[PDB]
Amino acid sequence: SGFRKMAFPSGKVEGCMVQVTCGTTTLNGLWLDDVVYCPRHVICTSEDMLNPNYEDLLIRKSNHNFLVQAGNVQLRVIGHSMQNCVLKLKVDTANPKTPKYKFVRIQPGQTFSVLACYNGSPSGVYQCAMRPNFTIKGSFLNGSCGSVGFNIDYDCVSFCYMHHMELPTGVHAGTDLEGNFYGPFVDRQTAQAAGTDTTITVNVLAWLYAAVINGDRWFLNRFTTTLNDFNLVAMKYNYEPLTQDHVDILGPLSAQTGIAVLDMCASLKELLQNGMNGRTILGSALLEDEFTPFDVVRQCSGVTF
Amino acid sequence: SGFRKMAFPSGKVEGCMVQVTCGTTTLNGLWLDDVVYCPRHVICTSEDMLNPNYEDLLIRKSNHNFLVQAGNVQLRVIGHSMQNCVLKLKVDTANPKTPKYKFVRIQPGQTFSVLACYNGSPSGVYQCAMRPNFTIKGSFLNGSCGSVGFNIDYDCVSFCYMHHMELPTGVHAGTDLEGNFYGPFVDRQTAQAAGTDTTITVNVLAWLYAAVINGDRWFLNRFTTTLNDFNLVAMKYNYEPLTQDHVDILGPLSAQTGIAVLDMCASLKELLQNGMNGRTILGSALLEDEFTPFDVVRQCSGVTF
Numbered sequence: 001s002g003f004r005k006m007a008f009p010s011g012k013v014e015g016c017m018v019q020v021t022c023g024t025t026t027l028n029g030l031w032l033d034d035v036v037y038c039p040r041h042v043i044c045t046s047e048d049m050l051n052p053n054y055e056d057l058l059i060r061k062s063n064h065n066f067l068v069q070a071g072n073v074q075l076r077v078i079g080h081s082m083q084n085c086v087l088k089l090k091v092d093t094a095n096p097k098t099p100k101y102k103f104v105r106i107q108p109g110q111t112f113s114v115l116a117c118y119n120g121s122p123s124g125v126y127q128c129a130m131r132p133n134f135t136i137k138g139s140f141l142n143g144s145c146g147s148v149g150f151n152i153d154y155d156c157v158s159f160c161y162m163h164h165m166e167l168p169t170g171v172h173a174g175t176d177l178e179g180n181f182y183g184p185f186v187d188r189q190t191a192q193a194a195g196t197d198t199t200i201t202v203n204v205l206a207w208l209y210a211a212v213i214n215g216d217r218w219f220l221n222r223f224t225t226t227l228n229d230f231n232l233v234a235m236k237y238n239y240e241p242l243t244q245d246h247v248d249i250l251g252p253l254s255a256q257t258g259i260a261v262l263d264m265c266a267s268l269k270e271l272l273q274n275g276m277n278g279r280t281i282l283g284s285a286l287l288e289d290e291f292t293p294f295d296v297v298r299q300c301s302g303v304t305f
Numbered sequence: 306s307g308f309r310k311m312a313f314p315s316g317k318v319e320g321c322m323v324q325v326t327c328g329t330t331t332l333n334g335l336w337l338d339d340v341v342y343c344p345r346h347v348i349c350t351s352e353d354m355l356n357p358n359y360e361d362l363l364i365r366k367s368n369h370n371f372l373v374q375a376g377n378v379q380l381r382v383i384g385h386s387m388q389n390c391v392l393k394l395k396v397d398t399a400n401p402k403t404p405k406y407k408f409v410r411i412q413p414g415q416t417f418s419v420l421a422c423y424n425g426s427p428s429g430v431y432q433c434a435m436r437p438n439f440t441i442k443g444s445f446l447n448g449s450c451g452s453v454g455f456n457i458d459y460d461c462v463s464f465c466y467m468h469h470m471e472l473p474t475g476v477h478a479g480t481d482l483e484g485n486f487y488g489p490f491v492d493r494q495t496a497q498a499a500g501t502d503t504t505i506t507v508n509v510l511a512w513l514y515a516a517v518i519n520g521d522r523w524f525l526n527r528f529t530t531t532l533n534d535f536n537l538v539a540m541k542y543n544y545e546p547l548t549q550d551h552v553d554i555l556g557p558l559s560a561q562t563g564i565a566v567l568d569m570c571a572s573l574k575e576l577l578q579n580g581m582n583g584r585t586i587l588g589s590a591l592l593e594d595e596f597t598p599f600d601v602v603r604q605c606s607g608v609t610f
């Protein structure tokens with residue numbers, strides 16, 4: 001019983017975090033086999049960062065401009081190259097702790113674990129969702145650049161995020177591990193705005209199912225509705241419209257609880273229209289949208305109450 | 306910027322988790338040097354669990370009754386002994402991944418990271434606070450027994466919790482690593498009730514300071530109050546009374562934000578008396594009490610807005 005924001009165990013990723021220094025700029029890198037991946041803006045000075053031309057800045061660097069440290073052990077850089085917004089530093093040693101891994105790009109609405117790091121040293125782990133506007137609501141201070149987000153499936157680490165920057169609103173933007181940004185952002189020190197965000201409906205419903213599985217039932221009702229009638233209310237409260245494929249993804253939770261998806265939509269309708277009236281769901285006083293259906297199944301009991 | 310429930314990186318603990326089987330009972334153990342620690346109720350059958358006499362049950366076991374696996378590698382048990390509610394199994398191999406560590410008992414109101422494990426395999430990490438009634442609001446399924454809670458200070462792991470059981474209310478109880486229970490519980494399959502819980506006031510105030518540091522200011526006001534006048538309101542809302550030592554612990558946050566503790570108490574007074582009126586603080590619609598002053602300092606920027 002219970003329901004917590006739960007990260008993947010971070011050990012397989014801790015063994016890959018290194019510190020990358022170029023000049024007076026220091027951030028984190030990800031060491032896999034004999035390659036270190038880090039944000040390319042490590043090559044920029046403070047003046048370069050306002051309007052960098054990265055092709056020019058990189059051509060002016062040599063391998064000896066990059067100090068890579070795995071603890072106190074220095075790693076000798078033997079080659080450098082750029083892939084989109086990621087710098088790739090070839091080192092002379094393959095990381096003996098390299099896990100099985102993939103580089104995958106995630107979709108808005110999906111979650112991942114973040115290993116927050118400073119000066120190559122892991123400091124904390126937490127869960128994040130990719131917002132519909134391609135930002136994440138992380139917890140990052142100066143020096144966290146190069147921290148990575150990941151999922152773990154059967155001892156294979158799927159890396160999906162490298163952290164690059166914080167926007168003026170305090171939310172965070174970065175790239176996949178191929179260096180392509182999530183969302184309409186660029187790695188320059190200029191004020192950039194994300195698009196308007198929306199609430200991830202399928203995740204809210206998954207979380208309501210988690211609540212029922214755990215025995216929180218006060219918000220249920222006997223009403224059912226239709227896909228089209230619900231999506232009218234979703235638009236009114238800035239929720240994403242619900243698709244039949246989302247209903248199917250929610251199938252296992254619907255089957256375990258015996259509550260049809262369109263039945264649960266009626267309960268969400270009333271929660272949106274009336275609030276909670278002082279009560280809580282799984283210890284929260286608002287509707288939580290950063291748990292996927294997979295996150296609920298992964299964490300919750302397989303047998304309902 | 307940002308504020309998340311943040312766990313310690315789990316790697317140093319992942320390297321210590323093993324599976325302990327006795328008969329048909331399987332749970333998790335903690336392998337440090339040449340000793341495996343696990344809940345003693347691994348020696349009980351289903352009938353034994355209703356009213357066990359552990360001294361009798363252990364005397365009837367030999368080393369060969371205990372199967373210990375670190376992955377697929379079986380570990381040979383060469384001695385067994387009981388310390389309170391913890392079983393200690395001596396193995397023939399010292400764990401090569403043993404970190405620097407301490408066994409410390411924590412106080413109600415303090416936090417720690419939990420590495421949730423099943424069949425010796427870590428599955429998730431999350432933060433927990435020890436409630437004033439000596440329970441934790443964890444996320445645990447059958448088979449999680451033996452999972453541990455810990456803090457990390459300078460590569461030293463301070464183990465403070467081993468998980469033993471879930472109460473009828475869905476909250477969780479366990480022991481320190483010396484096998485002494487937190488709270489008035491015993492390791493028998495009988496319905497046991499925790500004492501009435503209260504809200505951890507100093508933690509709520511720390512979290513309000515985190516909010517200000519991050520630029521959430523709507524709840525502040527110009528009023529100040531006295532320690533005695535606030536503790537009158539705390540009693541009314543089932544908060545713990547505030548002590549001068551708590552004010553001193555909050556000193557660094559008070560100094561960074563420039564908001565005196567008794568000033569912040571006035572704001573908490575009004576939040577308790579009026580609710581939030583639809584607004585949120587750090588993404589929550591209720592007052593959060595599972596972040597210590599240390600957790601806030603550790604995670605938040607050292608410079609206020």
Ligand SMILES: CN(C)CCCCCNC(=O)C[C@H](Cc1ccc(F)cc1)NC(=O)[C@@H](Cc1ccc(Cl)cc1Cl)NC(=O)[C@H](N)Cc1ccccc1C#N
Nearest residue numbers: 041140141142165166167168169170187188189190191520
């Ligand atoms: C909650 N509400 C109420 C209030 C919200 C609070 C809002 C206050 N937020 C800020 O001030 C963050 C601040 C905003 C900002 C952005 C652009 C601009 F023109 C002026 C200001 N952004 C940076 O300073 C960036 C600057 C930067 C640099 C390089 C590139 Cl390639 C890109 C960028 Cl953009 N710096 C980093 O992102 C560093 N790499 C890492 C870093 C540094 C400092 C702080 C956090 C982080 C992180 N993570």
Ligand SMILES: CN(C)CCCCCNC(=O)C[C@H](Cc1ccc(F)cc1)NC(=O)[C@@H](Cc1ccc(Cl)cc1Cl)NC(=O)[C@H](N)Cc1ccccc1C#N
Nearest residue numbers: 215346445446447470471472473474475492493494495496
């Ligand atoms: C949220 N609200 C709305 C509803 C709240 C939901 C409440 C429903 N909760 C329960 O039913 C949990 C259930 C309560 C219960 C407790 C005692 C009793 F007499 C009858 C029932 N307790 C157990 O079954 C215990 C039994 C047990 C065994 C050994 C010892 Cl040494 C001690 C104990 Cl106590 N079993 C374990 O704790 C296992 N070790 C581990 C385990 C098993 C199963 C499930 C979770 C866990 C964990 N973690």
